[PDB]
């Protein structure tokens, strides 16, 4: 009995929370109360099986039981569409159909933040409904969120209302906490979409390679075999979560945290404080721990991987473990290299051996592999450096605007709402990284860029429209950032000017939040480039100044909002001609 085994390992509160997540991530459109109802029926039944494993349907697989239960409300096609397809199939085809239909961008309303009082009240009314509502609204909007990590967010979200709703100043206590959750959640959501993309589109080998490089940078004192044990466990964990085996995911990860804390001494010296925290916090901690110091001396790599006379023999015995050791050994020594660079390096090294081990004295042919890594290291280095300089002398917003133009030009076919979100997010790399030293700037920057570009890829695949986007997204996971950086302006692009209402601001632009106000400013910049590309650089900055003041004043006009036409039509003319 599986549901019995998992129910007792995870305990009831989390079991219930994880089932609700699983339903909310598969049927993102079902209303909240329907999902709660289903989760409760499933929870009644689990207990039945805990009480008797030889009962009833207690011997079924989780996806059969859970899939059957979901389909009691999904099969209604007239309201869910293409999801009744999945309900016509049996496991495991049914689960695969659910995985294919996760929506990275469902047509759901913006999450709104009520007044602090309104929220504390709704919290006090029914604390448990308030929390499940949180789990539900986040999950359906982030169908790939790392499920056990979402439990931790709920925990903190609860603690924020519990504490701040009885502070003297409720707002001053509550708001900065939520803002912090909103921001960390967004980063965590994106980071985990990359994890699942790599698993699902590029396969297990890709995720393992990522894992060896990151855990080795993180745990450079650890023996190689230790890291492999860790890589293997971690790989099963994310394979389970991305495959929608959420109960197994949580359980296996909780065991993983345990194994780590009971063997810190063979892993890292940074884990002491983390391994004292409670269950959820402990696992949040370990997964993001700062890198350990690397051993003081360390050889030279060239000896075991270039000058040895057994390198072809080690490669031929087991490519995987030998290339793994290379990645292990090169990564431990380089916390200053991005994870992607480190993987380009291992691919270059792998490719070189496959060539040189042919014949004609291989030992002579592989002699300069490390001279090939040089330009691969230089390229990202100059990009980040050259970019931080540009950022520091422009400030996030103008930096964001510049990326917005350069990228609209790279791939103008791409929908505007997508260009805006990705650009703003790409631009965020300035604040996040440029503060850093050189020996910390690359992993901070490139891996973050890789996460943002994966968002581009997945928001685009749902409905493809740019060959170039599809090519970079499909061709090689590790090379995405280079493949996008190398794109120049699309010369084939045909502009679609005129206008109509896609430049006529309305009066409700005054009641929206300031960032949300830039979003319709930056939106309109995209339609400006998309239809008048090659408009240099400086009358772009002149049409942007012109949009700002026009909104500043027509919100001050106190008029019958006919100014939103007045200086609305006085820009349309200077914009085109001169
Ligand atoms: C329910 C929380 C809250 O309503 C809040 O007041 O902070 C809220 C929460 C969130 N967002 C929001 O726009 C708002 C509204 O600003 C976006 C967003 C992305 C997230 C991604 C991952 C995890 C939690 C997230 N929470 C929020």
**Residues 430 and 448 both lie in one domain:** yes
Q: How far is the CA of 59 from the centre of ligand 1 (A)?
A: 39
Final residue belonging to a domain, choices 352, 378, 404: 378
DSSP 291: P
CA 145 to ligand 1: nearest atom: 22
* Whole-number Å distance between alpha carbons of 330 and 311: 16
Q: How far is the CA of 146 from the centre of ligand 1 (A)?
A: 16
DSSP 415: -
Q: Is 577 helix (H, G, I), strand (E, B) or coil?
A: coil
Query: Two tokens at 95?
Result: 């689960």
Distance of CA 330 to the CA centre of its chain: 26
92 prior amide bond cis, ω within 30: yes
Q: How far is the CA of 170 from the centre of ligand 1 (A)?
A: 18
Q: Is the CB of 178 under 6 A from ligand 1?
A: yes
* Whole-number Å distance between alpha carbons of 52 and 213: 45
Three-state SS string over 318-386 comes to CHHHHHHHHHHHHHHCCCCCCHHHHHHHHHHHHHHHHHHCCCCCHHHHCCCHHHHHHHHHHHHHHHHHH
Q: How far is the CA of 181 from the centre of ligand 1 (A)?
A: 7
Three-state SS string over 416-464 comes to HHHHHHHHHHHHCHHHHHCCCCHHHHHHHHHHHHHHHHHHHHHHHHCCC
Write the DSSP string, 93-157. Answer: HHHHHHHHT--SS--PPPP----HHHHHHHHHH-HHHHHHHHHHHHHHH-TTS-HHHHHHHHHHH
**Residues 287 and 298 both lie in one domain:** no
Q: Is the CB of 143 under 6 A from ligand 1?
A: no
- Give the residue, by CA position, lying nearest to ligand 1 atom 6: 113
**Residues 405 and 508 both lie in one domain:** no
User: Using CA of residue 9, residue 12, residue 14, residue 16, what is the dihedral sign?
Assistant: positive
CA 179 to ligand 1: nearest atom: 7
Q: How far is the CA of 440 from the centre of ligand 1 (A)?
A: 30
- Please indicate, yes or no, if residue 573 is contained in any of the structural domains: no
* Whole-number Å distance between alpha carbons of 472 and 477: 8
The total of other beta-carbon atoms located within 10 Å of residue 436's CB is 15
* Whole-number Å distance between alpha carbons of 26 and 143: 7
Q: How far is the CA of 424 from the centre of ligand 1 (A)?
A: 18
Judge whether 556 is annotated as a binding position: no
Judge whether 320 is annotated as a binding position: no
Residue 440 near residue 428, CB atoms below 8 Å: no
**Residues 484 and 384 both lie in one domain:** yes
* Whole-number Å distance between alpha carbons of 39 and 45: 10
Phi, psi of 41 (to 5 degrees): -55, -50
- Please indicate, yes or no, if residue 260 is contained in any of the structural domains: yes
- Please indicate, yes or no, if residue 110 is contained in any of the structural domains: yes
Q: Is the CB of 138 under 6 A from ligand 1?
A: yes
**Alpha carbon distance, N-terminus to C-terminus of the chain:** 75
Q: Is the CB of 132 under 6 A from ligand 1?
A: no
**Residues 474 and 386 both lie in one domain:** yes
**Residues 550 and 528 both lie in one domain:** yes
Q: Is the CB of 142 under 6 A from ligand 1?
A: yes
- Crossing angle of helices 170-197/116-125, nearest 10°? 80
- Give the residue, by CA position, lying nearest to ligand 1 atom 12: 111
Residue 267 near residue 225, CB atoms below 8 Å: no
Residue 62 near residue 2, CB atoms below 8 Å: yes
Q: Is the CB of 515 under 6 A from ligand 1?
A: no
Residue 127 near residue 96, CB atoms below 8 Å: no
Q: Could you tell me how many residues make up the chain?
A: 578
**Residues 97 and 135 both lie in one domain:** no
Helices (H) and strands (E) in the chain, counts: 31, 0
**Residues 133 and 188 both lie in one domain:** yes
How many angstroms separate the Cα of 451 from the Cα of each of 81, 128, 283, 326, 543?
31, 34, 22, 25, 32
Residue 3 near residue 49, CB atoms below 8 Å: yes
User: How many structural domains comprise the chain?
Assistant: 6
- Give the residue, by CA position, lying nearest to ligand 1 atom 13: 111
Q: What is the domain extent for residue 259? A: 201-292
Nearest to 170 by CA among 113, 117, 125: 117
Nearest to 237 by CA among 218, 224, 256, 219: 256
Final residue belonging to a domain, choices 311, 346, 378: 378
Look-up: residue for tokens 């170039």? Answer: 468
Write the DSSP string, 460-490. Answer: HHTS---HHHHHHHHH-STTHHHHHHT----
Rounded-to-10 torsion of CA 507, 512, 518, 522:
-60
**Residues 476 and 545 both lie in one domain:** no
Instruction: Classify residue 359 as left (phi > 0), alpha (psi -120 to 50) or beta.
Output: beta
Q: Is the CB of 185 under 6 A from ligand 1?
A: yes
Q: Which CATH number characterizes residue 227's domain?
A: 1.10.246.10
Judge whether 35 is annotated as a binding position: no
* Whole-number Å distance between alpha carbons of 419 and 460: 10
- Please indicate, yes or no, if residue 283 is contained in any of the structural domains: yes
Final residue belonging to a domain, choices 331, 358, 378: 378
Per-residue buried b or exposed e for 250-267, using 16+ beta carbons within 10 Å of the residue's own CB = bbbbbebbeebbeebeeb
Nearest to 484 by CA among 455, 511, 453: 453
Q: What is the stated resolution of the deposited model, in angstroms? A: 2.4
Q: Is the CB of 189 under 6 A from ligand 1?
A: yes
C-alpha atoms less than 13 angstroms from C-alpha of 38 in its C-beta half-sphere: 24
- Give the residue, by CA position, lying nearest to ligand 1 atom 26: 182
**Residues 11 and 69 both lie in one domain:** yes
How many angstroms separate the Cα of 253 from the Cα of each of 8, 10, 99, 197, 257?
15, 11, 21, 20, 6
Residue 346 near residue 323, CB atoms below 8 Å: yes
Query: Two tokens at 513?
Result: 């939040």
Q: How far is the CA of 111 from the centre of ligand 1 (A)?
A: 7
Query: Two tokens at 176?
Result: 């900065």
Phi, psi of 437 (to 5 degrees): -65, 160
CA 114 to ligand 1: nearest atom: 6
Query: Two tokens at 380?
Result: 């990202």
* Whole-number Å distance between alpha carbons of 365 and 469: 36
- Give the residue, by CA position, lying nearest to ligand 1 atom 27: 182
Q: How far is the CA of 179 from the centre of ligand 1 (A)?
A: 8
Query: Two tokens at 515?
Result: 């960032």
Residue 256 near residue 244, CB atoms below 8 Å: no
- Please indicate, yes or no, if residue 345 is contained in any of the structural domains: yes
How many angstroms separate the Cα of 30 from the Cα of each of 108, 137, 360, 509?
11, 11, 65, 31
**Residues 347 and 268 both lie in one domain:** no
Judge whether 538 is annotated as a binding position: no
The total of other beta-carbon atoms located within 10 Å of residue 84's CB is 15
Q: How far is the CA of 519 from the centre of ligand 1 (A)?
A: 18
Judge whether 310 is annotated as a binding position: no
Where helices occur in 198-287 by DSSP H, the ranges are 204-218, 224-242, 246-261, 279-287
Nearest to 114 by CA among 89, 137, 140, 143: 137
Residue 397 makes CB contacts below 8 A (sequence gap 6+) with 427, 518
User: Hey, which of 182, 189, 193, 455 would you mutate to test ligand 1's pocket, going by the most ligand atoms within 8 Å of its Cβ?
Assistant: 182
Q: Is the CB of 237 under 6 A from ligand 1?
A: no
Judge whether 44 is annotated as a binding position: no
* Whole-number Å distance between alpha carbons of 126 and 129: 5
**Residues 331 and 413 both lie in one domain:** no
Residue 120 near residue 158, CB atoms below 8 Å: no
413 burial (CB, 10 Å; 0-12 / 13-18 / 19+) is middle
Q: Please name the helix (run of DSSP H) or strand (run of DSSP E) that holds residue 17, with its range, or none.
A: helix 12-26
* Whole-number Å distance between alpha carbons of 351 and 256: 34
- Please indicate, yes or no, if residue 444 is contained in any of the structural domains: yes
- Please indicate, yes or no, if residue 575 is contained in any of the structural domains: no
- Please indicate, yes or no, if residue 577 is contained in any of the structural domains: no
304 burial (CB, 10 Å; 0-12 / 13-18 / 19+) is middle
Phi, psi of 197 (to 5 degrees): -65, -45
Q: How far is the CA of 188 from the centre of ligand 1 (A)?
A: 12
């Amino acid at each position: 009995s599986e549901v019995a085994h998992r129910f007792k390992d995870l305990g009831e509160e989390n079991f219930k929370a994880l089932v609700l997540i699983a339903f909310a991530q598969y049927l993102q459109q079902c209303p909240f109360e329907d999902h709660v109802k289903l989760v409760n029926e499933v929870t009644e039944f689990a207990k039945t099986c805990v009480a008797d494993e030889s009962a009833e349907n207690c011997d079924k697989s989780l996806h059969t039981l859970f899939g059957d239960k979901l389909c009691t409300v999904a099969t209604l096609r007239e309201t869910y569409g293409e999801m009744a397809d999945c309900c016509a199939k049996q496991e495991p085809e049914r689960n695969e159909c659910f995985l294919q239909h996760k929506d990275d961008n469902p047509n759901l309303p913006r999450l709104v933040r009520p007044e602090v009082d309104v929220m504390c009240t709704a919290f006090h009314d029914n604390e448990e409904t308030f929390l499940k509502k949180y789990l539900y609204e986040i999950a359906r909007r982030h169908p790939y969120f790392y499920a056990p990590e979402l439990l931790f967010f709920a925990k903190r979200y609860k603690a924020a209302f519990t504490e701040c709703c009885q502070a003297a100043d409720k707002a001053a206590c509550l708001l900065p906490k939520l803002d912090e959750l909103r921001d960390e959640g967004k980063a965590s959501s994106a980071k985990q979409r990359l994890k699942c993309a790599s698993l699902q589109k590029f396969g297990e080998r890709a995720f393992k390679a990522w894992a060896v490089a990151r855990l080795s940078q993180r745990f450079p004192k650890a023996e190689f075999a230790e890291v492999s044990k860790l890589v293997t466990d971690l790989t099963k964990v994310h394979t389970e979560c991305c495959h929608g085996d959420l109960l197994e995911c949580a359980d296996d990860r909780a065991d993983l945290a345990k194994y780590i804390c009971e063997n810190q001494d063979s892993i890292s010296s940074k884990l002491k404080e983390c391994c004292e925290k409670p269950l959820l916090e402990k696992s949040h901690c370990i997964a993001e721990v700062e890198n350990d110091e690397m051993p003081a001396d360390l050889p030279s790599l060239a000896a075991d991987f270039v000058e040895s006379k057994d390198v072809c023999k080690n490669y031929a015995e087991a490519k995987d473990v030998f290339l793994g050791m290379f990645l292990y050994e090169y990564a431990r020594r380089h916390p200053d290299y991005s994870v992607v660079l480190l993987l380009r390096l291992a691919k270059t090294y792998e490719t070189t051996l496959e060539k040189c081990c042919a014949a004609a004295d291989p030992h002579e042919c592989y002699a300069k592999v490390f001279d090939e890594f040089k330009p691969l290291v230089e390229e990202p280095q100059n990009l980040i450096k050259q970019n931080c300089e540009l950022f520091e002398q422009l400030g996030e917003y103008k930096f964001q605007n510049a990326l917005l133009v350069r990228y609209t030009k790279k791939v103008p076919q791409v929908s505007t709402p997508t260009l805006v979100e990705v650009s703003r997010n790409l631009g965020k790399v300035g604040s996040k990284c440029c503060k850093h030293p050189e020996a910390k700037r690359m992993p901070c920057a490139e891996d973050y860029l890789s996460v943002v570009l994966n968002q581009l890829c997945v928001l685009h695949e749902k409905t493809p429209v740019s060959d170039r986007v599809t090519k970079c997204c499909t061709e090689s996971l590790v090379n995405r950032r280079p493949c996008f950086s190398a794109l120049e302006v699309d010369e084939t692009y045909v502009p679609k000017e005129f206008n109509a209402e896609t430049f006529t601001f309305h009066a409700d632009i005054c009641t929206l939040s300031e960032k949300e106000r830039q979003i319709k400013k930056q939106t309109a910049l995209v339609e400006l480039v998309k239809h008048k590309p090659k408009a240099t650089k400086e009358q772009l900055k002149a049409v942007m100044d012109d949009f700002a003041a026009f909104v500043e004043k027509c919100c001050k006009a106190d008029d019958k909002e006919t100014c939103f036409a007045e200086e609305g039509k006085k820009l349309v003319a200077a914009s085109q001609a001169a």
